Structure formats: C-alpha cells, structure tokens
Unconditional design. Structure first.
Ligand SMILES: CSC[C@H](NC(=O)COc1cccc2cnccc12)C(=O)N[C@@H](Cc1ccccc1)[C@H](O)C(=O)N1CSC[C@H]1C(=O)NC(C)(C)C
Lengths: 99, 99
C-alpha cells in the first residue's frame, strides 16, 4: 500500500485477535500501545517524548499484524493517547519513506 | 530517496541559513525544532505528545529545504528532544509511506 500524509497514518492492527487502530510512526523507535492486560512477562521501563517521560510495561515477542503483515517484537504498554507503531515493527513489514 | 527504517530517518535541513539534522516523523502533525532565532514574528502555542504539553513559538511561512526540496510552512521552535519534520512539511515534499 501507499499511504499519503494528508491525514494521520492510522491503520488496523491485530493483537490477540482484536483489532485496533494505530498510527504508523517513523519517529518512534519503540511501539507503544494503550493500556491492556496481556499475559506474559514484563519489565518496567520509562520512555520520553515531547512533553517528558511516562511509565510503561515492556513485553517481549508480541505478534501483531499490520494491514495483513505479521511482525513480532517488543511492545510497550502504558497510558498513551494513541497506539503507536514504531520503527521496530515497521521494518518487519517492509515499510519505507519515499520522496 | 527510499529510506528504510533500520536507522532513525535523519536528514539534513537548511533553515535560516543553518544546516541542521532532523527526523522525518509521520507521527507528528507539525514540525518542531530546538531553540533558535528565526527571522519573523511569532505567536505562543502549545503542543502535546507523550508526556504532556509544551509551549513553543510559532513561525509561519518559513522556507526550509529538506534534502534540497523546498517547503514553505509553519515551523514551531521549542524545547524538543529531537528536531521533527512533521506531516505539514512532509506533504509539501511529496512524502509517502510505502510497504
Ligand atoms: C508535533 S510534536 C507533537 C506530536 N503529536 C501529534 O502530532 C499528535 O498529538 C496528539 C494527537 C491526538 C491526541 C493527543 C493527546 N495528547 C497529546 C497529543 C495528542 C508528537 O509528539 N508526535 C509523536 C507521536 C505521538 C502522537 C500522539 C501522541 C503521542 C505521541 C512523534 O511522532 C514521536 O513519535 N516522537 C516525538 S518525540 C519522540 C517520539 C516519541 O514520542 N516516541 C515515543 C512514542 C515515546 C516512543
């Protein structure tokens, strides 16, 4: 697919057989998803963006699928406004920026 | 260019006769740079992201070159962790996400 940037590049993801919307973000190094209770093991972590830092739980090896493409890796869960797909998963689906 | 995302998408920008590095950021609506003097008149604005809300100065109709592609648009200057080129200027240079 090719996604223009007139609007925010929000797509559907599936994690644990539920669909969510998420922003595809080349500016994020990590993937941050809204609070949910996954089974599995986590570590505490702190991530920093524009206004400062928030606390998140880090889960490793989560499979998500982004517009039909599977990716597996580290997901951070915390109180974000929006679900963020960062470069750790975008590489696995083969995403590029082109101009 | 087609830019992969194995690394952060940093590019060189020319703004106000300086050269700077900035990240091409599809998760950002607007463009925020670190503290600088830009010619022109400005308005206080608030923006937010992970961690909260910051105040910035807004300069309208600033010419910037992103890898030799001109864009003339709003630039916000403020206490940012990284220089972000956001969707407001990424559309002008015809940037898309592809996978
Ligand atoms: C122009 S700078 C402000 C920008 N925010 C936006 O464009 C969108 O803002 C918002 C949209 C909707 C609801 C919001 C609620 N509260 C705050 C901001 C909101 C922004 O910070 N975008 C970031 C992503 C984002 C969007 C919306 C909420 C929160 C984060 C950026 O793309 C990124 O990846 N950055 C910018 S600094 C480092 C990095 C980053 O935050 N990294 C992570 C996500 C912490 C790993």
């Amino acid at each position: 697919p090719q996604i223009t940037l007139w609007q925010r590049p929000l797509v559907t993801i599936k994690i644990g057989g539920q669909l969510k919307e998420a922003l595809l973000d080349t500016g994020a190094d990590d993937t941050v998803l809204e609070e949910m209770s996954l089974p599995g093991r986590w570590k505490p972590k702190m991530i920093g963006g524009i206004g400062g830092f928030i606390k998140v739980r880090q889960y490793d090896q989560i499979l998500i699928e982004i517009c039909g493409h599977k990716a597996i890796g580290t997901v951070l869960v915390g109180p974000t406004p929006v679900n963020i797909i960062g470069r750790n998963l975008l590489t696995q689906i083969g995403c590029t920026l082109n101009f």
